[PDB]
């Protein structure tokens, strides 16, 4: 199961975190709730879905109405753990995807603002979160790369350079279809920065005259490779 008849009928029991949790179900596959009391007097409730593809572990506040930490794990290793404040709103939200790329939200304020970060393979980005979208900012000097992730899932990337020399000032355009960020300097294309669907970024340079590309795509591994491109 994901996330590592009788008597009056089925009966099922689960031991999690060195604390035995037992419940009763109807079907003969394992779909049912698992109530369980803690030693610290908290309440732990574990749920197994009908198609056995999504667990829902929740922690409750002794009276079992207020929450502590709901962790919703799925069949493709995708876990979405959340922690809750003293008044019911989400304090932290960690979205571990299928590939292991976590997406951390920390210290969320009451107006929908927090300290976000996307954890990729090899590097750890940073940013913030407003109600509209998540914004991931990678700066180097005067160029500030901005990765806008909406709350609906759309990925858009804007670039801003505060340069003044039109020979060295750097612009960038976006094609949501190609998912490529085309950078331009002095009316001459310099490189592409593709954000692959599998939570990775690829750099590929154009030739010195901006006609077509050169070499192959480079899977970024360190954070300084992004800044190197800026």
């Amino acid at each position, epitope marked *: 199961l994901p996330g590592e008849k009788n008597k009056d009928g089925y009966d099922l029991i689960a031991t999690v975190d060195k604390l035995e949790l037992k419940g009763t179900s109807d079907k003969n596959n394992g779909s049912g*709730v698992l109530e369980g009391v803690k030693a610290d007097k908290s309440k732990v*409730k574990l749920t197994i879905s009908d198609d056995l593809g999504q667990t829902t572990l929740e922690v409750f506040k002794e009276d079992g109405k207020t929450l502590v930490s709901k962790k919703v794990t799925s069949k493709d290793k995708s876990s979405t753990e959340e922690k*809750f*404040n*003293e*008044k*019911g*709103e989400v304090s932290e939200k960690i979205i571990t995807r299928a590939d292991g790329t976590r997406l951390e939200y920390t210290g969320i304020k009451s107006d929908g603002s927090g300290k976000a970060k996307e954890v990729l393979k090899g590097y750890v980005l940073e940013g913030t979160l407003t109600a509209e979208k998540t914004t991931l900012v990678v700066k180097e000097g005067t160029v500030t790369l901005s990765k806008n992730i909406s709350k609906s899932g759309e990925v858009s990337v804007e670039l801003n350079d505060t340069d003044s020399s039109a020979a060295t000032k750097k612009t960038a355009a976006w094609n949501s279809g190609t998912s490529t960020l085309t950078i331009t300097v002095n009316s001459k294309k310099t490189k592409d920065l593709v954000f692959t669907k599998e939570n990775t970024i690829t750099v590929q340079q154009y030739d010195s005259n901006g006609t077509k590309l050169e070499g192959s795509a480079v899977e970024i591994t360190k954070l300084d490779e992004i800044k190197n491109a800026l």
Partner: antibody
Amino acid sequence: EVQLVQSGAEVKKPGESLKISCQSSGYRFTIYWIGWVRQMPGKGLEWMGIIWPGDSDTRYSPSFQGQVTISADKSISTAYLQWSSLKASDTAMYYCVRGIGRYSNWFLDYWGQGTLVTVSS
Amino acid sequence: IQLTQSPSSLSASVGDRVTITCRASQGFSSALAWYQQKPGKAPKLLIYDASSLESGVPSRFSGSGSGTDFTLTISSLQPEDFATYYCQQFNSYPLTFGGGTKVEIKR
């Protein structure tokens, strides 16, 4: 042992302000939301607003924003529903409710016995 | 979010198994609650998170649903279960309630 004692029933006339209170007890007053829910006669349950004591985090429903004032005095474990220039269209039953927090919202696990506000000349 | 709650009137005998339906204008998962307003008194919370029974109500009350249709269920109707039953949404601001469902006991 969680109880909610509300103000007695009130008669008013269109033009008067009105304050009604609800006295929570049995739990830690400064950790659970308290709000007000309206039940128009014949009509269903309408939600007015809610507040979190104590930091006075007040949240209202658009159908009532600017029409009502909700407060809570944590020194006496008491929430207030407050008007000014009552209308006859405000005649309903008002329940102080204790709220349990969900994502930016609540359900209501405890309800007061109700305060009936009649507004006629 | 409009909340259509059906049926409106309902009669059944003691021991039956009745099912109320709450139909939401928008879809969600496990973000609805059930209340029992007995005559003269105030609403009492029956079901929270659409599947969790609150300690203090009998075991015969149950509720389930997902998507756009929800359901509250009574395993063995009793003459004290005579009341009106409401469904409340806490998915989207602001909160809403269903039109109500009267439950009559046949005798």
